[PDB]
Nucleic acid binder design. Sequence first.
DNA 1: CGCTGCGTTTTTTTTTTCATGTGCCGGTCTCACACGTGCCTGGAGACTAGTAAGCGCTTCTAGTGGCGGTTAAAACGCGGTAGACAGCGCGTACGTGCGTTTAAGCGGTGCTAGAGCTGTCTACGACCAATTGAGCGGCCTCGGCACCGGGATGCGATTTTTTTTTTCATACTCGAG
DNA 2: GTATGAAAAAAAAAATCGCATCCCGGTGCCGAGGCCGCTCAATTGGTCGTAGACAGCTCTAGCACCGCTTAAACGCACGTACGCGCTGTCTACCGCGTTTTAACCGCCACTAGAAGCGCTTACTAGTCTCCAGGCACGTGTGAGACCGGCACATGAAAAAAAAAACGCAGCGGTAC
Lengths: 55, 98, 98, 82, 80
Amino acid sequence: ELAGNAARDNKKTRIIPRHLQLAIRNDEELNKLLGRVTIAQGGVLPNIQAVLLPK
Amino acid sequence: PHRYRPGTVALREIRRYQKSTELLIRKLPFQRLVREIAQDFKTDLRFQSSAVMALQEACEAYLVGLFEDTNLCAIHAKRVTIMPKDIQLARRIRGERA
Amino acid sequence: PHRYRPGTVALREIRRYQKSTELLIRKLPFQRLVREIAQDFKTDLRFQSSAVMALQEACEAYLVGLFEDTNLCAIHAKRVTIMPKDIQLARRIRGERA
Amino acid sequence: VLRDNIQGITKPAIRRLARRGGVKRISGLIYEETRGVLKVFLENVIRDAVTYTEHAKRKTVTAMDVVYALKRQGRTLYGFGG
Amino acid sequence: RDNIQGITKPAIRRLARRGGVKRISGLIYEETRGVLKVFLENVIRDAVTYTEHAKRKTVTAMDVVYALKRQGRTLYGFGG
DNA sequence: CGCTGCGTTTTTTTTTTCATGTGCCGGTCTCACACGTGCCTGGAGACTAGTAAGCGCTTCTAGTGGCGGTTAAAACGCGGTAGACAGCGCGTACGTGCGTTTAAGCGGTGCTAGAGCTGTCTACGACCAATTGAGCGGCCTCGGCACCGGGATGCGATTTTTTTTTTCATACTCGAG
DNA sequence: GTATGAAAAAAAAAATCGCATCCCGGTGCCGAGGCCGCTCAATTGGTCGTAGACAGCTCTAGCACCGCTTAAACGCACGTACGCGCTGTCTACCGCGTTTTAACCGCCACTAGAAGCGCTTACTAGTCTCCAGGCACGTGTGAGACCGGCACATGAAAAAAAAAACGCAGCGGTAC
Ligand SMILES: [Ca+2]
Ligand SMILES: [Ca+2]
Ligand SMILES: [K+]
Ligand SMILES: [K+]
């Protein structure tokens, strides 16, 4: 459901891993349940700590 | 000429590598290391290409996750640079060392 | 007048409690909490006295564990006072939270 | 009859925990922060425990329920029926 | 050989950048090389134990999955 | 007036007491370890029997070199800038330790919910054939996504047009000729 | 003589500038999607046997009080040392442009070892009967905590003594 949504947002018909990653890490519960699970070829949610941003 | 101010290439180098998933260690180097480290536990072993990539997909996931924790520690010290005494604090709290 | 300098008793107080093992939370209070918290899940429950004690041992051990992780984060920021931010950081790297 | 017991984890008691911690100096904000983390932790374990109690059609929570709960939560306790 | 140095400075920096690290002390590079080696050693050990026990002289993806799952670092998308 | 040193008064630093909590010795009382005894259940014996697993042989995959070529990627080094670390000041939040107040603890005592065993019955799942059609390996195809450029779009960075205070010198104002 | 006024510099906001990232198509290739017929693993149906549902009974142990005792919690007060922000020095870590290197391709040929298929044996589960190991009772004696008296190393105070700003006084110098 969520990973299909993630694909449409990246204009893709075919769900790749990163869609699954994006889907899981942004759903609090699924993220909890898959807390110690590594998703292959799924990289990391974009996060950059505020105090690192300039100006 | 023109040049970007120390950091602004980094911030980009972040945005780039967060939005992507390609494995960031060179495949063959890694694989030699794996067989180096494997000879320890048994000689003349053989690996399925996939089994190397399974390891490489983990190592990278782990190190990435570590640096994340590392960075939050460096920042806790009102710093921006990561240093060994940030990794070590993470790994201690994680429970990898004593 | 005779008084000990801030953080001298504190240090004694450490040595005392690190040498000993007894539960440091007065037992009735703790028990009352546990039942208050059991209501949130099922009305008119009952507890084996050993269950109540098996929790207090667990909680007290956890907290004492946290404050050690906590205390290394305070110290990481060249401090000595422990602050919510430190616990927050510790739970963060532990996986107790996002 | 005392609906807010989290308070009964008194500042001194938490100080002592923190002492066994090896903590020299304690911000005032802590106690409450601690009380809160305590609450979560008890809440989490006791949920799982009562689940185990309920699964056995018992009205009485056993020491074993609490162990099965602590083992799941990754938080394993020796000396109550382990 | 000593293939650990084959984990070049720029590759570690690459990982750190995915990690969201702006600035990187020169020391880090060798430290990281250390932590990496521990991690590979530990996984590979249990992996090759799982291999040896099946009596194979070839390490499978499933060896490595089983290891990672033991080591508490469960992996999706190579089986298991 | 300005300095200069030199006796003064205070501050810093040393030395010696001193009041404190330590962990150290040796006698009393408690309930917890250890024994023991007798009963009962769960391990051992042994033999039956049926099937898992190990070894060799059959095939064929999928893993290990190895061979150059081009390119993207590391290497290295130089140059500067911003961030790490120390050092100053200020301010309040902790810490100690005193007195008031509270609620924990303790131990013995009386009820009663609910544990938990114990001996029944009966629906429910194992098992054991025989059947059959889904799910799996295998072969085509074709339509997403990956790679190309090419240009529009966003953003940091540098290099040019606005306040701010100050800074060193010039237009007004009282008596003077 | 004096209030005065425009130059320096500082700080800042805006416009080249250029630089790297997103969208528009066009190109092609490869991997997902889908059918094919073949194989075994799911279903059908029946019986044998046990697991567990059930209702009692038993007694446990969990609840809840009584009512002293005291320790711990609470609540103030005074002050110190720690947290925290602000600065300014230097150096180490980023950014960009030479030079060096080795990875990633798309081929090669060869072999092990993986992975499957069979046949044979020795290894387990499965009956039952029979002892003894092991546990739930009741007893007792001793380790250990608890109490209170000790020197005892201590950090905190008190008592002298080796320095840094403060008066205050002597005196030289210098224009007038
Ligand atoms: Ca019942
Ligand atoms: Ca004593
Ligand atoms: K093979
Ligand atoms: K009971």
